[PDB]
Amino acid sequence: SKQLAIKKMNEIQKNIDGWEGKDIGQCCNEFIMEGTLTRVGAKHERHIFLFDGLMICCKSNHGQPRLPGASSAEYRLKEKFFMRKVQINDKDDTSEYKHAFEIILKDGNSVIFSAKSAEEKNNWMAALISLQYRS
C-alpha cells in the first residue's frame, strides 16, 4: 500500500485549490495548467490539472445521478500520471480542428490530448515543454 504518490494528488487538489497562479508544491504542483483537455480527437474531454510535471484528470464516473443520498455517489478524481520524462509534439492538421498534440511515454504508450480551444490546445503543449527546458 505505498500510494504515498497517489495520496499527494488529494492534498494537491485541496491544499492548494485549483488555479494557475498560486502554488503549493516546489516543482510538482503550482497547477501550471488548470483547465480542460481531452485525449486526441475525442468527443468527451475531461477536467485536467497539469502540475508543471504531473498530469491529473477528473470527470464524472457514472454520469450525473438524479441526486446524492438516494442510491450511492461515485464522483471523484479520474486518473493521474507523471509528465516529466515525456515530450509533447505537434501535427499538421487543419486550424479547423484536430489540432491537438501527441506526447509519448518511454515505456510503450502515447499521451495524446486535445484542448477544446485554440489557445487551450497550444497552452498545455507549452506547459509541458516549458518544464522540460529545466525542471
From Swiss-Prot:
Domain of life: Eukaryota
PH domain location: 31-135
Tissue expression summary: Expressed in most embryonic and adult tissues.
Subunit structure: Interacts (via C-terminus) with GRB2 (via SH3 domain). Forms a complex with phosphorylated MUC1 and GRB2 (via its SH3 domains). Interacts with phosphorylated LAT2. Interacts with NCK1 and NCK2. Part of a complex consisting of ABI1, EPS8 and SOS1.
Record function comment: Promotes the exchange of Ras-bound GDP by GTP. Probably by promoting Ras activation, regulates phosphorylation of MAP kinase MAPK3 in response to EGF. Catalytic component of a trimeric complex that participates in transduction of signals from Ras to Rac by promoting the Rac-specific guanine nucleotide exchange factor (GEF) activity.
Protein name according to UniProt: Son of sevenless homolog 1
Annotated organism of origin: Mus musculus
Gene this protein is translated from: Sos1
